[PDB]
Amino acid sequence: VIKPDGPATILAIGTSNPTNIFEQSTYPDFFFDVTNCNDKTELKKKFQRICDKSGIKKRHFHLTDEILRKNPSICKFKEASLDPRQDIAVLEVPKLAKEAAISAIKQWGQPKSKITHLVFATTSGVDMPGADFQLAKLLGLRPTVKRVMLYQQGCYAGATVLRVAKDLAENNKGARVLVACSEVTAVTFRAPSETHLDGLVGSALFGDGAAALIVGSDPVPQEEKPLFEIHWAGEAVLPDSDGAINGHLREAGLIFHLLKDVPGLISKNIDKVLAEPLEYVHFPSYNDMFWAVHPGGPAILDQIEAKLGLSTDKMQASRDVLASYGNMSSASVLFVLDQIRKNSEELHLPTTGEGFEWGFVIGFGPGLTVETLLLRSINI
Amino acid sequence: VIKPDGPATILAIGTSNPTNIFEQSTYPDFFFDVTNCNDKTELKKKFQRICDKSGIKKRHFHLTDEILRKNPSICKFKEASLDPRQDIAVLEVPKLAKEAAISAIKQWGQPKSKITHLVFATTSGVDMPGADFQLAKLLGLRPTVKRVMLYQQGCYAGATVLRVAKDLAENNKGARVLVACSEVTAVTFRAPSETHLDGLVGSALFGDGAAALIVGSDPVPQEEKPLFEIHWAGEAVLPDSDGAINGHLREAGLIFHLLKDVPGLISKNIDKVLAEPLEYVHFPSYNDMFWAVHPGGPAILDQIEAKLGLSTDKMQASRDVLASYGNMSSASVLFVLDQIRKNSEELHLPTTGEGFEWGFVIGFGPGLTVETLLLRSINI
């Protein structure tokens, strides 16, 4: 059996976001108005404070005043609302991923018939057949596409899809994996409550977006353009982090429980989490590496930056994504990678990874699970 | 980078089921009593006829008369019931898998510390952290265990976990994958209705169970005992099968809709689906192969048997699993593999695959997706 020789390589990155732009400056005005919570004046000041410090400037949402008016239960706190949230999500998640996938396939330059695998991740509702099937059908991929559907994996899923794609691409000759992460906040949209302060954080951070990539080993020279090589993939459940990030798909929708200790737990353990991939590549200085860190919140980026002694330009690509699109869960880290290669091509840098050789793709979510990938950039 | 040489090998199989046995003969009496539908006499006769022709003799359930009385909403048709269904499923799914995993690890003979990967599949509710995290924690596996959580993939998931485990084991040296499939019917439990005849099928067929396997390449001689080798893994979405098995996770739980003839569609296309792996091994006669077909119902086993001209003993292991435990979704096909292996050992057959060299693991579900794996048995 002939197995491919080279590491799993990202051959194309494409992104998409819904067209309805919501400025973070005035998001509390919209948020408290659609959920009929204008009377909760003290809670609005608290949400304004969180939004002002969120590092987010704008977010793209599928949900509008019109869609929330047509589905009033989504605007209610504890009322049965899973059915209309799912009906929106099940349709929009693969549709958004379709636009991201088309852009990734167009950038790749090869026909869609060469796609042998499909890895899809979403935390925006569940359905049978899954979003993976829906995407495959919408794009017109081969009916024999090998699918890996990753439902409800949260914010580390951007890293999980690349970890899964690594093994699929590297173990199958000629395998070209379509990776897709798509998040639509229809299921997580929570009305503000004085009893759910961690729900205000999620409401200030979560945005919509989709990212798609083509991953494959042994790139065909003068045909495919290698962007990043995946050299190591792994994860870690952080000690004493039980219940730090919980998410339950209830009748009222997807309820997130975020403890305030999340940025601190990641900072305390980030050096230990990065220990194994660092030794694989002979301990390069943190400041000699590129960083595609999931913008879970600004406090996570600020505290990883401070704990590791990183120069302020390292977290810039992550902060730019957070500023322009917010926390798009699984999609976020792939948008960061796209921004890293785009900045590199725009500035005519030595490599696709901001001039640096090695880099990290870090995602975090439920567990607390921190998913890490060691990437090598390509010389340009 | 040193990659392993051999194919992904099943090194141990362990199974588990809840202790409450419900005989199929009198199941309609229990079912119509807990759901308060004793007055629906004509529907009871129709359900009795489905249970009598189901090929199922007994099913193991976590749900009892006691648990259903303490959770009245689960016994209702359209009343909001996802919350108590989830509370039960989220706790019981990894607990059942723990028991199956312990049995698999014990049969393997190596410490649990050597497990580098965990692939979990379930259609019995969703949660963040997933059932994968919960299983890893309950077993005390390394905090760095690489996880693949397969939620809501239905009845093909038993084959998907093996396809995923194939690439993980074959692309990583020393990798030992814990495969786990666990199904508890708390979410699929549907009160009988004259307006949901598709629900009667699921009510007559779905049972509880868990199966766990240890998958790895390059077995260390005189330490590990190879049971089956995975040589090919793939899938296919059957033509003109749109909406054949639709499953929606609603407020009232998991609702199934069967818009097409599932057993008829698989039979018509099975020759075409099996074409690629048969080609890999020079088209051996179907009757010279072992069959680990998912016991979705009696019709699928009967119709594949008739279309492919199989001798009656081929579907026996699948029929024995259906008879003893019903349709345990993802877990079923792995129980069949265990039964094929067990029959082979007790009858002192030449191979672990009932004397035959090559064989198929066929899973089917939403799409209509048919997942197939080509396995080679081990000489004993």
Ligand SMILES: CC(C)(COP(=O)(O)OP(=O)(O)OC[C@H]1O[C@@H](n2cnc3c(N)ncnc32)[C@H](O)[C@@H]1OP(=O)(O)O)[C@@H](O)C(=O)NCCC(=O)NCCS
């Ligand atoms: C939420 C966040 C943007 C707030 O900005 P900040 O720079 O931390 O500013 P502060 O911490 O001083 O203020 C945050 C306010 O929200 C509260 N808050 C922050 N995180 C909270 C949480 N997880 N649960 C409840 N309240 C929280 C703080 O207590 C404070 O409330 P206050 O008005 O009574 O003082 C920041 O803490 C952050 O990014 N946190 C991580 C968010 C996260 O975990 N994201 C991943 C989600 S999967």
